[PDB]
């Protein structure tokens, strides 16, 4: 898939999807009971990469129970073409794979985001109306 | 597919590349604006399209059309997409003066109620029938060759091509409307 | 434009979108009342091609109401570039077309589910906003 | 003996015949080539499309059913259509934004299936032989004229084209009978 | 992004996002009170292009307050490859940008509109 859920309280975790750069992967921890906090981690200070398929935590707390990892591809041309240079197969491959990855990314997250945005607007209207 | 039709074609690019073929040079592959040829070709193509489309046919003349004035004042605008304005079965006096509709009979520009006339509007180049597109492309190629690069043998063939296409346009026109002449006649 | 529906009870049907291969076309029968009895048809034994843009049916369409045809492009690559070969136009053309097609069905799929939530949220927000604001401000 | 050929195709041979007008040898495949191989195909396709859209006894289909959609009632306009008309009356049909437009009612909302007459397009390799030869000669004339002006390669293609045109005529006239005396009978 | 809103009662406006063809720009008038009052303008009759970044309105704004501009990428090819021609970098750039734009818009647009409605409410 493109979204993963893991129970908190473990030392090691593994990813299940390909990527083009380590900056694309995003890791955050979520409170089910309290949706407010749901803060995001940070590279270097809080986690590091030994193995390209392994993720290892540095800091951890106990107030959270689930951890979410999902992919997020950027909207910039990774490869750059200039006159007076050489053409390699890897560039041609990656240029094609970018938009392909973006497709099934959006296909997944769009409908989920629509839900909380819509009912948040509805709840805002409701509390404004009654008070 | 190379057999049936190439997938996802672009009509304007094909027309331009065909127009440069008369000179004797290969394709352009982008239709950019920096190049000199494209800018010269596009204006000629647009002008020829506008000229040919405004002759009146059976699929352009909208006999019944409704125009309405605005509220603040009593005027009707003259859009730049209008080509011919006439009345169906009588004499008409209509013209443009300062971007408004003028009636020479009454010498005023103050209409108070909606009216009905017939008119001919413009359409994008890509939605015309095929024979018209070929005729327009051949015509435009003739000007492009004549004004920017004089070739003696590319000519003397486009003339026959133009005549042959004009004939086909004619019998295409004569088929849409049956045009019976013995109608409205009957008695013992 | 990559999803189409027609009334049931015919023998001949038309295809109205481009495709790269004949295995990217899917035909299925649809029951509106109970969307749990849908069936998927397969080439050779249920339907046959006639020309690149039209097919023929061979089974009994009883108990169904709609016939649906849509496109589903695969994800595996088509052209494999290698160092030492010669560059040709067809490879570039196919590589471009595959990505364009995939993006097309992706957008067509996502917009369908997005719209009904979007417009409802917007309308409710605007209605409540104007009603409350003008009413309370005039009252005070 | 005979001339049992090797790996025969109905497109490569046509391209080779078009190339023979200038006086160049034949190629073995179309995947790679210089500008000429990529210059002939455009003209060939255009000429094929132009010729096929004139109406013949084996093209015109009088009865044909077009079915509207189920969600939003409209009818699409595929790019393979060539002519849309009606059997025995006047018609007002045109294309507006990739849909079927009826000028008489000034609308794009059909509700029930319609029957019209239309002409579709076929691949090059399934037309009768005489038509293929006529198309090849017509394309070759233009190809010679636009890129390499020779006074001997001309003055012969016209003579051949006239005969091919004639042959197409008597071929067309034999498919149908067209007897005027029909539909008449009385004592 | 790929969608913008501006107050009404002006003569000119600005285009900030990027596009590949000039037919990919859509302009719409917004009525805050009733969404059903929205209407979509059409080029040439209501507005014209002065420069590659600026337009000017030609119709009056009476019962409207917000002007909305978004992007709609086409489906036909912009770059076509043929043997025997000259190939440069801009061709390869545009060939990929066309594919990227469609997916970007299809993922972002509706969510962005939902954001705008939500924080406006």
Q: Which two tokens stand for residue E83?
A: 């043997």
Q: How far apart are CA B13 and CA B8, in angstroms?
A: 12
Q: Which residues of A touch E107 (CB under 8 A)?
A: 102, 105-106, 109-110
Q: Inspect the structure and tell me whether chains B and A have 3 or more CB pairs less than 8 Å apart.
A: no
Show Cβ contacts of residue A131 under 8 Å, excluding neighbours closer than 6 positions: none
> Which of C126, C129, C134 is the best substitution to test chain E (most E C-beta atoms within 10 A)?
C126
Provide the resolution (angstroms).
3.1
> Which of D67, D98, D114 is the best substitution to test chain C (most C C-beta atoms within 10 A)?
D67
CA distance B67 to chain D (A): 15
Which residue does chain C place closest to E94, by CA atoms?
C96
8 A C-beta contact, residue A106 and residue E103: yes
8 A C-beta contact, residue D39 and residue D17: no
Q: Which residues of E touch C118 (CB under 8 A)?
A: 110, 113-114, 117
8 A C-beta contact, residue E8 and residue E65: yes
CA distance E59 to chain D (A): 24
Of B10, B28, B81, the CB nearest to E45: B81
- Tell me how the structure was determined: cryo-EM
Show Cβ contacts of residue B56 under 8 Å, excluding neighbours closer than 6 positions: B84, B120
Which residue does chain D place closest to B7, by CA atoms?
D79
Of C75, C81, C124, the CB nearest to A92: C81
Closest CA to A54 of A106, A104, A1, A14: A14
Provide the H-helix boundaries in chain B. Answer: 11-21, 36-53, 130-148, 158-176
Which residue does chain C place closest to D67, by CA atoms?
C6
CA distance A33 to chain E (A): 23
Closest CA to A76 of A98, A97, A100: A98
Q: Inspect the structure and tell me whether chains D and A have 3 or more CB pairs less than 8 Å apart.
A: no
Q: How far apart are CA A80 and CA B60, in angstroms?
A: 50
Q: Does B18 touch chain D (CB under 8 A)?
A: yes
Q: How far apart are CA E35 and CA E46, in angstroms?
A: 21
CA distance E83 to chain A (A): 18
Chains that touch B (3 or more CB pairs under 8 A): C, D, E
Name every residue in A having a CB less than 8 A away from some CB of E. 75, 77, 81-83, 95, 98-99, 102-103, 105-106, 109-110, 113-114, 117-118, 120-121, 124-125, 128
Task: Indicate the helix (H) or strand (E) that contains E25.
Answer: strand E25-30
Q: Which residues of E touch B9 (CB under 8 A)?
A: 76-77
Which residue is listed with tokens 């045009």?
Answer: B179
> Cβ of B5 and D106 within 8 Å?
no
8 A C-beta contact, residue D119 and residue D156: no
8 A C-beta contact, residue C8 and residue C66: yes
Burial C12-34 (b: 16+ CB within 10 A, else e): ebebebbbbeeeebebebeeeee
Q: Which residues of D touch B178 (CB under 8 A)?
A: 88-90
Which residue does chain C place closest to B2, by CA atoms?
C90
**Helix/strand/coil (H/E/C) assignment for every residue in chain D:** CCCCCCCCCCCHHHHHHHHHCCCCCCCCCCCCCCHHHHHHHHHHHHHHHHHHCCCCCCCCECCCEECCCCCCCCCECCCCCCEEECCCCCCCEEECCCEEEECCCCECCCCCCEECEEECCCCHHHCCHHHHHHHHHHHHHHHHHHHCCCCCCCCCHHHHHHHHHHHHHHHHHHHCCCCCCCCCCCC
CB atoms inside a 10 Å sphere around CB A123:
11
Closest CA to B106 of B119, B89, B92: B92
Q: Which two tokens stand for residue B184?
A: 């409205």
> Cβ of E97 and A81 within 8 Å?
no
Of E35, E103, E113, the CB nearest to C103: E103
Inter-helix orientation angle D129-147/D35-52, to 10°: 130
Q: How far apart are CA B154 and CA E86, in angstroms?
A: 25
What does the angle CA D72 – CA D74 – CA D77 come to, to the nearest 5 degrees? Answer: 135
> Cβ of A95 and E93 within 8 Å?
no
Chains that touch E (3 or more CB pairs under 8 A): A, B, C, D
Residue contacts between A and C (CB atoms, under 8 Å): 61
If contacts are CB pairs under 8 Å, which of residues 72-101 in chain E contact chain D?
A: 82-84
3-class state of residue B133 by DSSP: helix
């Amino acid at each position: 898939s493109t979204i993963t859920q893991f129970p908190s309280g473990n030392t090691q975790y593994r990813i299940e999807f390909d990527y083009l750069a380590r900056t694309f992967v995003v890791v955050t921890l979520v409170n089910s009971s309290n949706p407010t906090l749901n803060r995001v981690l940070e590279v270097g200070r809080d986690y590091r990469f030994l193995n390209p398929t392994m993720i290892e935590m540095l800091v951890d707390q106990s107030g959270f129970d689930i951890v979410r990892i999902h992919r997020q591809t950027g909207t910039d041309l990774v490869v750059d073409f200039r006159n007076g240079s050489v053409l390699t197969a890897s560039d041609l491959t990656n240029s094609e794979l970018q938009a392909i990855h973006i497709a099934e990314e959006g296909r997944d997250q769009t409908v989920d985001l629509a839900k909380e945005y819509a009912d948040a607007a509805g709840s805002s209207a409701g509390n404004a109306k009654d008070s | 597919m190379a057999q049936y039709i190439p997938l996802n074609a672009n009509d304007d690019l094909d027309a331009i590349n065909d127009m440069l073929a008369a000179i004797g040079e290969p394709a352009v592959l982008q239709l950019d604006e920096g190049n000199a040829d494209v800018s010269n070709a596009q204006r000629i193509l647009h002008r020829v399209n506008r000229q040919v489309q405004a002759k009146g046919w059976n699929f352009n003349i909208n006999e019944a059309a409704v125009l309405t004035p605005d509220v603040q004042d009593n005027r009707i605008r003259f859009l730049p997409s209008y080509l011919r304005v006439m009345t169906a079965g009588a004499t008409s006096y209509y013209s443009n003066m300062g971007g408004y509709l003028y009636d020479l009979s009454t010498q005023s520009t103050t209409f108070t109620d909606p009216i009905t006339v017939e008119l001919v509007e413009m359409k994008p180049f890509s939605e015309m029938p095929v024979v018209f597109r070929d005729y327009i492309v051949t015509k435009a190629s003739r000007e492009f060759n004549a004004k920017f690069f004089g070739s003696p043998e590319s000519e003397l063939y486009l003339r026959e091509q133009e005549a042959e296409l004009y004939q086909q346009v004619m019998e295409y026109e004569m088929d849409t409307g049956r045009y019976n002449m013995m109608s409205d006649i009957g008695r013992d």
